[PDB]
């Protein structure tokens, strides 16, 4: 589990969005496994605006923050999960590291702020759904 709270937006894995997230939908993209919903309260998080390829992610299945190198956001074939059939996932960054399904929502951070959230993995990889291209999360 996990979310990003920036301005009056909540950014979650689409596959973990709640009833309230759908009722209060701002934007979602199945191919990215992202959903953004509106919030009452102001969030404290900053979104990175950068092309960093190094950062730190939170892995709930290890209770550990791991420094990683990751690929630039790309279109990657992802095997079937509980939530999606086997398909190409877009805006996805890969790193060598530990990931289990319930690690989804773990934040990946760089010096500039939030880079993305855990969305995929296994096989000794972790995949993050990038948010840095979503410039509108910084306004309105
Ligand atoms: C932009 C980018 O990928 N830079 C990068 C690479 C490796 C380490 C660090 C520490 C800060 N930035 C780092
Ligand atoms: C959607 C989903 O289940 N994502 C996910 C994240 C991290 C690791 C794994 C291993 C299978 N699936 C994973
Ligand atoms: Zn950065």
Curated annotation (Swiss-Prot):
Binding site for Zn(2+) 1: 50, 52, 110, 112
Reactions this protein catalyses: Selective cleavage of Tyr-|-Gly bond in the picornavirus polyprotein
Active site, renumbered: 15, 33, 104
Coiled coil: none
Record's subunit section: Homodimer.
Record function comment: Cysteine protease that cleaves viral polyprotein and specific host proteins. It is responsible for the autocatalytic cleavage between the P1 and P2 regions, which is the first cleavage occurring in the polyprotein. Also cleaves the host translation initiation factor EIF4G1, in order to shut down the capped cellular mRNA translation. Inhibits the host nucleus-cytoplasm protein and RNA trafficking by cleaving host members of the nuclear pores. Counteracts stress granule formation probably by antagonizing its assembly or promoting its dissassembly.
Protein name: Protease 2A
Origin species: Coxsackievirus A16 (strain G-10)
